[PDB]
Symmetry: C3
Amino acid sequence: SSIIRKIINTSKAPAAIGPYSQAVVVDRTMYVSGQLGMDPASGQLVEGGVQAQTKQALVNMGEILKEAGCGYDSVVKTTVLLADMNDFASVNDVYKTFFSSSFPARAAYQVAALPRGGLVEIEAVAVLGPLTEV
Amino acid sequence: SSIIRKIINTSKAPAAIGPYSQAVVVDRTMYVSGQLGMDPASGQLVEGGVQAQTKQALVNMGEILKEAGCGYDSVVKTTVLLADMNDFASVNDVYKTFFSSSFPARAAYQVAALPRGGLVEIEAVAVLGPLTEV
Amino acid sequence: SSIIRKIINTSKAPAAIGPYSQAVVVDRTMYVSGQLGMDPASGQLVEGGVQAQTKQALVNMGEILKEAGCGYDSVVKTTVLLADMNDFASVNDVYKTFFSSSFPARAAYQVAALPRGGLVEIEAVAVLGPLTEV
Protein backbone atom coordinates (compact mmCIF):
# COMPACT_ATOMS: atom_id res chain seq x y z
CA SER A 1 0.00 0.00 0.00
CA SER A 2 3.07 2.22 -0.48
CA ILE A 3 2.80 4.28 -3.68
CA ILE A 4 5.86 4.67 -5.87
CA ARG A 5 6.76 8.16 -7.02
CA LYS A 6 9.27 8.73 -9.80
CA ILE A 7 10.62 12.14 -10.75
CA ILE A 8 11.02 12.17 -14.53
CA ASN A 9 14.01 14.00 -15.91
CA THR A 10 15.54 13.86 -19.36
CA SER A 11 18.05 16.11 -21.07
CA LYS A 12 16.14 15.40 -24.29
CA ALA A 13 13.65 18.03 -23.06
CA PRO A 14 14.61 21.48 -21.72
CA ALA A 15 15.65 21.92 -18.13
CA ALA A 16 12.81 23.29 -16.00
CA ILE A 17 12.86 27.10 -15.83
CA GLY A 18 11.59 27.09 -12.25
CA PRO A 19 11.29 24.81 -9.17
CA TYR A 20 9.39 22.00 -10.86
CA SER A 21 10.02 18.55 -12.27
CA GLN A 22 9.43 17.84 -15.96
CA ALA A 23 6.94 15.21 -14.83
CA VAL A 24 6.02 13.19 -11.75
CA VAL A 25 4.79 9.62 -11.89
CA VAL A 26 2.77 8.29 -8.95
CA ASP A 27 1.71 4.65 -9.36
CA ARG A 28 0.45 4.62 -12.96
CA THR A 29 -0.48 8.31 -13.27
CA MET A 30 1.93 10.83 -14.78
CA TYR A 31 1.56 14.57 -14.27
CA VAL A 32 3.43 16.43 -17.03
CA SER A 33 4.45 20.04 -16.46
CA GLY A 34 3.40 22.83 -18.75
CA GLN A 35 5.55 22.47 -21.86
CA LEU A 36 6.76 25.57 -23.68
CA GLY A 37 8.15 25.67 -27.22
CA MET A 38 11.74 25.78 -26.01
CA ASP A 39 14.75 24.22 -27.66
CA PRO A 40 16.15 21.64 -25.21
CA ALA A 41 19.77 22.68 -25.91
CA SER A 42 19.63 26.47 -25.67
CA GLY A 43 16.48 26.79 -23.59
CA GLN A 44 15.27 29.53 -25.91
CA LEU A 45 11.86 29.61 -27.51
CA VAL A 46 12.08 28.37 -31.09
CA GLU A 47 11.66 30.81 -33.95
CA GLY A 48 8.80 30.93 -36.41
CA GLY A 49 5.68 31.58 -34.31
CA VAL A 50 2.87 29.67 -32.68
CA GLN A 51 2.85 26.51 -34.81
CA ALA A 52 6.61 26.10 -34.40
CA GLN A 53 6.27 26.62 -30.65
CA THR A 54 3.34 24.20 -30.41
CA LYS A 55 5.31 21.56 -32.28
CA GLN A 56 8.35 22.02 -30.05
CA ALA A 57 6.24 21.95 -26.87
CA LEU A 58 4.70 18.65 -27.98
CA VAL A 59 8.07 17.20 -29.06
CA ASN A 60 9.33 18.10 -25.57
CA MET A 61 6.26 16.42 -24.06
CA GLY A 62 6.99 13.33 -26.13
CA GLU A 63 10.55 13.07 -24.85
CA ILE A 64 9.27 13.31 -21.25
CA LEU A 65 6.63 10.65 -21.94
CA LYS A 66 9.26 8.37 -23.53
CA GLU A 67 11.56 8.78 -20.52
CA ALA A 68 8.71 7.37 -18.42
CA GLY A 69 8.04 4.51 -20.88
CA CYS A 70 4.94 6.16 -22.39
CA GLY A 71 3.95 7.67 -25.71
CA TYR A 72 1.40 10.19 -26.93
CA ASP A 73 -1.26 7.49 -26.80
CA SER A 74 -0.89 7.46 -22.98
CA VAL A 75 -2.17 11.03 -22.63
CA VAL A 76 -5.68 11.32 -21.21
CA LYS A 77 -6.01 15.07 -20.54
CA THR A 78 -4.25 18.22 -21.67
CA THR A 79 -4.59 21.94 -21.05
CA VAL A 80 -3.66 24.27 -23.91
CA LEU A 81 -2.75 27.77 -22.76
CA LEU A 82 -2.52 30.42 -25.50
CA ALA A 83 -1.12 33.92 -25.65
CA ASP A 84 -3.63 34.72 -28.47
CA MET A 85 -7.06 33.08 -28.93
CA ASN A 86 -6.76 33.89 -32.65
CA ASP A 87 -4.27 31.02 -32.72
CA PHE A 88 -6.75 28.27 -31.72
CA ALA A 89 -7.12 26.82 -35.23
CA SER A 90 -3.40 26.97 -36.01
CA VAL A 91 -2.55 25.29 -32.70
CA ASN A 92 -5.23 22.65 -33.22
CA ASP A 93 -3.77 21.78 -36.63
CA VAL A 94 -0.41 21.00 -35.04
CA TYR A 95 -1.88 19.38 -31.92
CA LYS A 96 -3.94 16.83 -33.87
CA THR A 97 -0.81 15.48 -35.56
CA PHE A 98 0.49 14.32 -32.13
CA PHE A 99 -2.93 13.29 -30.76
CA SER A 100 -4.66 11.98 -33.85
CA SER A 101 -7.37 9.64 -32.48
CA SER A 102 -8.86 8.70 -29.09
CA PHE A 103 -8.09 12.29 -28.29
CA PRO A 104 -7.34 13.44 -24.79
CA ALA A 105 -9.87 15.39 -22.85
CA ARG A 106 -8.86 19.05 -23.02
CA ALA A 107 -9.36 22.58 -21.86
CA ALA A 108 -8.07 25.51 -23.87
CA TYR A 109 -8.08 29.23 -23.28
CA GLN A 110 -6.13 32.43 -23.75
CA VAL A 111 -4.12 33.54 -20.72
CA ALA A 112 -2.69 37.00 -20.10
CA ALA A 113 0.94 35.89 -20.44
CA LEU A 114 3.14 32.81 -20.40
CA PRO A 115 6.67 32.35 -19.02
CA ARG A 116 9.40 33.76 -21.23
CA GLY A 117 6.76 35.35 -23.43
CA GLY A 118 5.82 32.03 -24.95
CA LEU A 119 2.88 31.77 -27.33
CA VAL A 120 1.64 28.39 -26.07
CA GLU A 121 2.05 26.15 -23.03
CA ILE A 122 0.63 22.61 -22.83
CA GLU A 123 0.34 20.48 -19.68
CA ALA A 124 -0.87 16.89 -19.54
CA VAL A 125 -1.98 13.89 -17.53
CA ALA A 126 -0.94 10.48 -18.86
CA VAL A 127 -1.42 6.91 -17.65
CA LEU A 128 1.39 4.38 -17.90
CA GLY A 129 0.41 1.43 -20.11
CA PRO A 130 -0.60 -1.10 -20.99
CA LEU A 131 -3.87 0.65 -21.89
CA THR A 132 -6.96 -1.11 -23.24
CA GLU A 133 -9.41 0.91 -25.35
CA VAL A 134 -13.13 0.23 -24.87
CA SER B 1 -2.64 -4.68 -14.71
CA SER B 2 -3.99 -3.36 -18.03
CA ILE B 3 -5.94 -0.12 -17.54
CA ILE B 4 -9.18 0.37 -19.44
CA ARG B 5 -9.65 3.65 -21.28
CA LYS B 6 -13.04 4.70 -22.59
CA ILE B 7 -13.60 7.69 -24.84
CA ILE B 8 -16.91 9.25 -23.82
CA ASN B 9 -19.06 10.66 -26.58
CA THR B 10 -22.70 11.63 -26.54
CA SER B 11 -24.78 13.66 -28.96
CA LYS B 12 -26.66 14.95 -25.91
CA ALA B 13 -23.70 17.33 -25.43
CA PRO B 14 -22.17 19.47 -28.21
CA ALA B 15 -19.61 18.02 -30.55
CA ALA B 16 -16.07 19.01 -29.57
CA ILE B 17 -14.94 22.21 -31.32
CA GLY B 18 -11.35 20.97 -31.57
CA PRO B 19 -9.27 17.75 -31.45
CA TYR B 20 -10.45 16.56 -28.05
CA SER B 21 -12.85 14.03 -26.57
CA GLN B 22 -15.79 15.18 -24.43
CA ALA B 23 -14.31 13.06 -21.65
CA VAL B 24 -11.84 10.23 -21.13
CA VAL B 25 -12.29 7.53 -18.52
CA VAL B 26 -9.20 5.64 -17.34
CA ASP B 27 -9.98 2.95 -14.74
CA ARG B 28 -12.33 4.82 -12.39
CA THR B 29 -11.14 8.37 -13.11
CA MET B 30 -12.92 10.58 -15.64
CA TYR B 31 -11.33 13.68 -17.13
CA VAL B 32 -14.04 15.99 -18.49
CA SER B 33 -13.12 18.59 -21.09
CA GLY B 34 -13.75 22.27 -20.61
CA GLN B 35 -17.48 22.75 -21.10
CA LEU B 36 -18.77 25.90 -22.78
CA GLY B 37 -22.36 27.16 -22.69
CA MET B 38 -23.12 25.79 -26.14
CA ASP B 39 -26.41 24.38 -27.36
CA PRO B 40 -25.77 20.72 -28.28
CA ALA B 41 -27.88 20.98 -31.47
CA SER B 42 -26.61 24.18 -33.08
CA GLY B 43 -23.23 24.37 -31.37
CA GLN B 44 -23.82 28.06 -30.72
CA LEU B 45 -23.41 29.72 -27.36
CA VAL B 46 -26.79 30.14 -25.71
CA GLU B 47 -28.29 33.60 -25.38
CA GLY B 48 -28.87 35.52 -22.17
CA GLY B 49 -25.41 35.98 -20.65
CA VAL B 50 -23.16 34.36 -18.09
CA GLN B 51 -25.75 32.56 -15.93
CA ALA B 52 -27.40 31.05 -19.01
CA GLN B 53 -24.00 29.96 -20.31
CA THR B 54 -22.97 28.54 -16.93
CA LYS B 55 -26.20 26.56 -16.74
CA GLN B 56 -25.76 25.19 -20.26
CA ALA B 57 -22.10 24.30 -19.63
CA LEU B 58 -23.12 22.34 -16.53
CA VAL B 59 -26.08 20.68 -18.30
CA ASN B 60 -23.59 19.61 -20.99
CA MET B 61 -21.25 18.31 -18.28
CA GLY B 62 -24.15 16.36 -16.79
CA GLU B 63 -24.94 14.64 -20.08
CA ILE B 64 -21.27 13.61 -20.43
CA LEU B 65 -21.23 12.31 -16.85
CA LYS B 66 -24.45 10.36 -17.47
CA GLU B 67 -23.02 8.80 -20.62
CA ALA B 68 -20.23 7.41 -18.43
CA GLY B 69 -22.68 6.19 -15.75
CA CYS B 70 -21.94 9.08 -13.35
CA GLY B 71 -23.78 12.08 -11.98
CA TYR B 72 -22.85 15.46 -10.53
CA ASP B 73 -22.12 13.76 -7.21
CA SER B 74 -19.17 11.98 -8.88
CA VAL B 75 -17.29 15.24 -9.50
CA VAL B 76 -14.29 15.78 -7.23
CA LYS B 77 -12.58 18.81 -8.83
CA THR B 78 -13.56 21.56 -11.24
CA THR B 79 -11.89 24.58 -12.79
CA VAL B 80 -14.09 27.59 -13.53
CA LEU B 81 -12.67 29.87 -16.21
CA LEU B 82 -14.35 33.28 -16.56
CA ALA B 83 -14.24 36.00 -19.18
CA ASP B 84 -15.10 38.57 -16.43
CA MET B 85 -14.20 38.25 -12.72
CA ASN B 86 -17.20 40.49 -11.97
CA ASP B 87 -19.26 37.40 -12.76
CA PHE B 88 -17.93 35.25 -9.88
CA ALA B 89 -21.02 35.62 -7.69
CA SER B 90 -23.49 35.11 -10.54
CA VAL B 91 -21.63 32.01 -11.71
CA ASN B 92 -21.41 30.65 -8.16
CA ASP B 93 -25.19 31.01 -7.76
CA VAL B 94 -25.76 28.76 -10.78
CA TYR B 95 -22.88 26.40 -9.99
CA LYS B 96 -24.14 25.59 -6.48
CA THR B 97 -27.45 24.34 -7.87
CA PHE B 98 -25.58 21.51 -9.68
CA PHE B 99 -23.01 20.92 -6.91
CA SER B 100 -25.05 21.59 -3.79
CA SER B 101 -23.18 19.68 -1.04
CA SER B 102 -19.89 17.78 -0.63
CA PHE B 103 -18.66 20.33 -3.10
CA PRO B 104 -15.85 19.60 -5.49
CA ALA B 105 -12.47 21.10 -4.95
CA ARG B 106 -12.14 24.06 -7.30
CA ALA B 107 -10.00 26.73 -8.83
CA ALA B 108 -11.53 29.79 -10.44
CA TYR B 109 -10.05 32.75 -12.26
CA GLN B 110 -10.56 35.20 -15.08
CA VAL B 111 -8.78 34.31 -18.31
CA ALA B 112 -8.06 36.66 -21.22
CA ALA B 113 -10.45 34.90 -23.61
CA LEU B 114 -12.34 31.65 -24.11
CA PRO B 115 -13.08 29.73 -27.32
CA ARG B 116 -15.90 31.20 -29.39
CA GLY B 117 -15.97 34.22 -27.10
CA GLY B 118 -17.63 32.26 -24.34
CA LEU B 119 -18.19 33.84 -20.94
CA VAL B 120 -17.43 30.70 -18.90
CA GLU B 121 -15.72 27.34 -19.38
CA ILE B 122 -15.79 24.57 -16.75
CA GLU B 123 -13.61 21.44 -16.73
CA ALA B 124 -13.84 18.60 -14.22
CA VAL B 125 -12.42 15.43 -12.74
CA ALA B 126 -14.94 12.80 -11.64
CA VAL B 127 -14.65 9.32 -10.14
CA LEU B 128 -16.93 6.52 -11.27
CA GLY B 129 -19.05 5.19 -8.38
CA PRO B 130 -19.94 3.66 -6.14
CA LEU B 131 -18.58 6.41 -3.87
CA THR B 132 -18.61 6.29 -0.07
CA GLU B 133 -18.59 9.58 1.84
CA VAL B 134 -16.52 9.76 5.03
CA SER C 1 -14.69 -1.63 -5.18
CA SER C 2 -16.40 1.31 -3.44
CA ILE C 3 -14.16 4.40 -3.41
CA ILE C 4 -13.98 6.49 -0.25
CA ARG C 5 -14.40 10.23 -0.62
CA LYS C 6 -13.50 12.60 2.21
CA ILE C 7 -14.28 16.30 2.19
CA ILE C 8 -11.37 18.06 3.87
CA ASN C 9 -12.20 21.04 6.04
CA THR C 10 -10.09 22.81 8.61
CA SER C 11 -10.51 26.15 10.32
CA LYS C 12 -6.71 26.43 10.21
CA ALA C 13 -7.17 27.50 6.57
CA PRO C 14 -9.66 30.15 5.38
CA ALA C 15 -13.25 29.25 4.74
CA ALA C 16 -13.95 28.76 1.04
CA ILE C 17 -15.11 31.98 -0.64
CA GLY C 18 -17.43 30.09 -2.98
CA PRO C 19 -19.23 26.71 -3.35
CA TYR C 20 -16.15 24.52 -3.09
CA SER C 21 -14.40 22.32 -0.55
CA GLN C 22 -10.87 23.15 0.60
CA ALA C 23 -9.88 19.73 -0.71
CA VAL C 24 -11.43 16.42 -1.70
CA VAL C 25 -9.77 13.07 -1.11
CA VAL C 26 -10.85 10.12 -3.27
CA ASP C 27 -9.02 6.88 -2.40
CA ARG C 28 -5.41 8.08 -2.13
CA THR C 29 -5.66 11.14 -4.38
CA MET C 30 -6.27 14.61 -2.95
CA TYR C 31 -7.48 17.52 -5.07
CA VAL C 32 -6.63 20.81 -3.34
CA SER C 33 -8.55 23.94 -4.28
CA GLY C 34 -6.85 27.06 -5.53
CA GLN C 35 -5.27 28.67 -2.47
CA LEU C 36 -5.17 32.44 -2.16
CA GLY C 37 -2.97 34.43 0.22
CA MET C 38 -5.80 34.95 2.69
CA ASP C 39 -5.54 35.12 6.45
CA PRO C 40 -7.58 32.21 7.85
CA ALA C 41 -9.09 34.36 10.63
CA SER C 42 -10.21 37.49 8.78
CA GLY C 43 -10.43 36.03 5.29
CA GLN C 44 -8.62 39.08 3.94
CA LEU C 45 -5.62 38.94 1.67
CA VAL C 46 -2.45 39.47 3.68
CA GLU C 47 -0.52 42.70 3.31
CA GLY C 48 2.92 43.11 1.79
CA GLY C 49 2.57 41.93 -1.82
CA VAL C 50 3.13 38.84 -3.90
CA GLN C 51 5.72 37.03 -1.76
CA ALA C 52 3.61 37.50 1.37
CA GLN C 53 0.55 36.23 -0.50
CA THR C 54 2.45 33.27 -1.95
CA LYS C 55 3.69 32.33 1.50
CA GLN C 56 0.21 32.56 2.99
CA ALA C 57 -1.34 30.56 0.14
CA LEU C 58 1.20 27.79 0.70
CA VAL C 59 0.79 27.90 4.50
CA ASN C 60 -2.96 27.50 3.89
CA MET C 61 -2.24 24.59 1.54
CA GLY C 62 -0.07 23.02 4.24
CA GLU C 63 -2.85 23.18 6.82
CA ILE C 64 -5.25 21.49 4.36
CA LEU C 65 -2.66 18.80 3.59
CA LYS C 66 -2.07 18.22 7.33
CA GLU C 67 -5.80 17.87 7.96
CA ALA C 68 -5.76 15.00 5.46
CA GLY C 69 -2.64 13.42 7.04
CA CYS C 70 -0.27 14.68 4.31
CA GLY C 71 2.57 17.14 4.04
CA TYR C 72 4.20 19.18 1.29
CA ASP C 73 6.12 16.08 0.21
CA SER C 74 2.79 14.50 -0.84
CA VAL C 75 2.21 17.10 -3.58
CA VAL C 76 2.72 15.79 -7.12
CA LYS C 77 1.35 18.65 -9.26
CA THR C 78 0.58 22.32 -8.77
CA THR C 79 -0.73 25.17 -10.89
CA VAL C 80 0.56 28.66 -10.11
CA LEU C 81 -1.75 31.42 -11.30
CA LEU C 82 -0.30 34.95 -11.27
CA ALA C 83 -1.79 38.40 -11.58
CA ASP C 84 1.58 39.65 -12.98
CA MET C 85 4.11 37.52 -14.93
CA ASN C 86 6.82 39.91 -13.69
CA ASP C 87 6.38 38.13 -10.36
CA PHE C 88 7.51 34.67 -11.57
CA ALA C 89 10.97 34.84 -9.97
CA SER C 90 9.72 36.29 -6.68
CA VAL C 91 7.00 33.64 -6.46
CA ASN C 92 9.46 30.87 -7.33
CA ASP C 93 11.77 31.99 -4.52
CA VAL C 94 8.98 31.52 -1.97
CA TYR C 95 7.56 28.38 -3.61
CA LYS C 96 10.87 26.49 -3.50
CA THR C 97 11.04 26.88 0.28
CA PHE C 98 7.87 24.74 0.61
CA PHE C 99 8.71 22.36 -2.25
CA SER C 100 12.47 22.11 -1.99
CA SER C 101 13.31 18.78 -3.70
CA SER C 102 11.50 16.11 -5.75
CA PHE C 103 9.52 19.06 -6.96
CA PRO C 104 5.95 18.74 -8.11
CA ALA C 105 5.10 18.90 -11.75
CA ARG C 106 3.79 22.40 -12.45
CA ALA C 107 2.16 24.81 -14.81
CA ALA C 108 2.41 28.54 -14.30
CA TYR C 109 0.96 31.49 -16.13
CA GLN C 110 -0.46 34.97 -15.76
CA VAL C 111 -4.26 35.15 -15.67
CA ALA C 112 -6.39 38.24 -16.23
CA ALA C 113 -7.63 38.39 -12.63
CA LEU C 114 -7.97 36.30 -9.48
CA PRO C 115 -10.75 36.24 -6.88
CA ARG C 116 -10.65 39.14 -4.44
CA GLY C 117 -7.93 40.77 -6.51
CA GLY C 118 -5.35 38.31 -5.29
CA LEU C 119 -1.85 38.34 -6.74
CA VAL C 120 -1.38 34.54 -6.75
CA GLU C 121 -3.51 31.41 -6.54
CA ILE C 122 -2.05 27.90 -6.24
CA GLU C 123 -3.95 24.63 -6.69
CA ALA C 124 -2.52 21.15 -6.18
CA VAL C 125 -2.85 17.40 -6.51
CA ALA C 126 -1.37 15.31 -3.69
CA VAL C 127 -1.21 11.58 -2.97
CA LEU C 128 -1.74 10.26 0.53
CA GLY C 129 1.35 8.41 1.81
CA PRO C 130 3.24 6.35 2.40
CA LEU C 131 5.16 7.37 -0.74
CA THR C 132 8.28 5.63 -2.03
CA GLU C 133 10.71 7.62 -4.16
CA VAL C 134 12.35 5.84 -7.11
